[PDB]
Structures are given as structure tokens and as C-alpha cells.
A paper describes a structure:
Mammalian [name] (Rap1-interacting factor 1) is a multifunctional protein involved in DNA repair and replication. The two isoforms differ by a 26-amino acid sequence encoded by Exon 31, which is present in [name]-Long ([name]-L) but absent from [name]-Short ([name]-S). Here we reveal a potential reason for this difference, with the discovery of a new [name] function that can be fulfilled only by [name]-L. Specifically, we show that under replication stress [name]-L interacts directly with [name]. This interaction is mediated by a phosphorylated ‘SPKF’ motif within the Exon 31-encoded [name]-L-specific sequence, which binds the C-terminal tandem BRCT domains of [name]. In summary, our investigation establishes [name]-Long as a new functional binding partner of the [name]-BRCT domain, crucial to protect cells from extended DNA replication stress by enabling RAD51-dependent repair of broken replication forks.
With Serine 2265 phosphorylated, this ‘phospho-SPKF’ sequence corresponds to a potential interaction site for the C-terminal tandem BRCT domains of [name] protein, which recognise the motif ‘phospho-SPxF’. To explore whether [name]-L can interact with [name], we used fluorescence polarisation to analyse in vitro binding of a [name]-L-derived phosphoS2265PKF peptide to the tandem BRCT domains of [name]. We found that the tandem [name]-BRCT domains bound strongly to the [name]-L phosphoS2265PKF peptide, with interaction affinity comparable to that for a phospho-peptide from BRIP1, a characterised [name]-BRCT interacting partner. In contrast, the tandem BRCT domains of 53BP1, MDC1 and TOPBP1 did not bind the [name]-L phosphoS2265PKF peptide. Consistent with this, we found that mutating F2268 of the [name]-L phosphoS2265PKF peptide abolished its binding to [name]-BRCT (inverted triangles). Treatment with λ phosphatase also abolished binding of the [name]-L phospho-peptide to [name]-BRCT (squares), confirming that S2265 phosphorylation is essential for the interaction. Mutating S2265 to glutamic acid did not enable interaction with [name]-BRCT (triangles), indicating that phosphoS2265 could not be substituted by this negatively charged residue. To directly visualise the binding interface, we determined the structure of [name]-BRCT in complex with a [name]-L phospho-peptide by X-ray crystallography. The phosphoS2265PKF motif fits within the BRCT pocket of [name] as expected, with the [name] phsophoserine and the phenylalanine in the +3 position making the expected interactions based on previously determined structures of BRCA-BRCT domain ligands. The positively charged amino acids K2267 and K2269 of [name]-L lie adjacent to the negatively charged E1698 [name] residue, explaining the preference of the [name]-L phosphoS2265PKF motif for the [name]-BRCT over BRCT domains from other proteins.
Residue numbers in the entry:
A (entry chain E): 2261 to 2270
B (entry chain A): 1650 to 1859
């Protein structure tokens, strides 16, 4: 489920 | 000492609060200039995903360490050394690039030294002021508008854009008509920060129409 933080994919 | 966490569930976050309180470490929700540690969720090989906290921790030369530092210290009933849990890489830029360590050891030679950057146009998932903070931590100055570049001998200008955030507006192809600086995607910044190595612009240039 992780966090609500956005990830920056390639 | 002051820490943030990144990629943790609410339950993991509440465990870190107890750990930090026990060891007299401040825990905050957002990164600050006073943050000393960024605790990243990683796989067992210390590879994380790229979040804003990851970038800002590297850009600041802070300790960017795996959450295993917390859980293993607890298991062993001893505060373990951060250098043994330092994040080795990320899923985008590579599993063992060691950007975090490089940044921690290279603040006398910042990757964006001598650059003036305009973070231009709309951005998703990372507000303009946070991208601006990132590049300033890495030695760049920032300008708000294209007409505000210095165009002098002591700095080099760069325009940073996220084309997908413009949707149906192709104006990001027309920046060269208004401005002499090279125009690159936001990935130029993000890749350079994660690796703590200033990348060549070649693969990031946005085609400009005459």
C-alpha cells in the first residue's frame, strides 16, 4: 500500500 | 538529528516515530534544510523508488538510508551505522549508482555549479518551488521568467520543462523563439540529482521549432 508520496518513473 | 521517511505505510511511519522519539531524533512529515536523514523504503538490496524526499536528500548531501536501518537496529538492540544502510540506487537510474554517497562526499563541487535555471511552465507531482529548491541545493540560481536570464560570462542558462504537463499546448516547442538557452526535460534534473552527476543535455533536449 506504501504512502501517498508521488514516485518519479523513467 | 532530524529525519523524514519516504515510501512507508502509516504503520511503519508510526514505528519510526517511536524509534525517533526513543533516540532523540526529530521526525517531520516534510523535508527541511535541517533534515539530517531521509529513510527510504527499499528492497533488501537497498534500492528505492524516486520520491521528492529522495531527490532533496541527495541534493542536500544528507544521509539517505534504508528503512532496514531502523528495523535492524531494533532487532540488534543497537544503533547501527548509517553508512552500512546507505541507499545504493533506485529503480530508474540504476541499482548501484551510489548517488547518495557521492552527494554526501561532493558538496564542494556541486553538480549545477555555475548554472542559472528557469523551471518553466506547469509541472505534475512536484511543485515548481520544490524543483527550484532542488536545483539551488545543487548550486544553481533560479529565474522565474525567460526574460530574466543573465546572459553573462559567469553563469550558463538552462530552461527545464515537463512537456507532458502541457497536454494539448505545444508551446514548449516554441521556447527557442523567445530565448537563447537550451531547453531540456525535467528528467535532466532528476537523473542528474539521483546520480549526483550533471548529465549531458543531449538526450534531454526538447525539439524547438523555428
Amino acid at each position: 500500500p506504501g504512502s501517498r508520496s508521488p514516485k518519479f518513473k523513467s | 538529528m532530524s529525519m523524514v521517511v519516504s515510501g512507508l505505510t502509516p504503520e511503519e511511519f508510526m514505528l519510526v516515530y517511536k524509534f525517533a522519539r526513543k533516540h532523540h531524533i526529530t521526525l517531520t512529515n516534510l523535508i527541511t534544510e535541517e533534515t539530517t536523514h531521509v529513510v527510504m523504503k527499499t528492497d533488501a538490496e537497498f534500492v528505492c523508488e524516486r520520491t521528492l524526499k529522495y531527490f532533496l536528500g541527495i541534493a542536500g548531501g544528507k544521509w539517505v538510508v534504508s528503512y532496514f536501518w531502523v528495523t535492524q537496529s531494533i532487532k540488534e538492540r543497537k544503533m547501527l551505522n548509517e553508512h552500512d544502510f546507505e541507499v545504493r540506487g533506485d529503480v530508474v537510474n540504476g541499482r548501484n549508482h551510489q548517488g547518495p554517497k557521492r552527494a554526501r562526499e561532493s558538496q564542494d563541487r556541486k553538480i549545477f555549479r555555475g548554472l542559472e535555471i528557469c523551471c518553466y511552465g506547469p509541472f505534475t507531482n512536484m511543485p515548481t518551488d520544490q524543483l527550484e529548491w532542488m536545483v539551488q541545493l545543487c548550486g544553481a540560481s533560479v529565474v522565474k521568467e525567460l526574460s530574466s536570464f543573465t546572459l553573462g560570462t559567469g553563469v550558463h542558462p538552462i530552461v527545464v520543462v515537463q512537456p507532458d504537463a502541457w497536454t494539448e499546448d505545444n508551446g514548449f516547442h516554441a521556447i527557442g523563439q523567445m530565448c537563447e538557452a537550451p531547453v531540456v526535460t525535467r528528467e535532466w534534473v532528476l537523473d542528474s540529482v539521483a546520480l549526483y552527476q550533471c548529465q549531458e543535455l543531449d538526450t534531454y533536449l526538447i525539439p524547438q521549432i523555428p
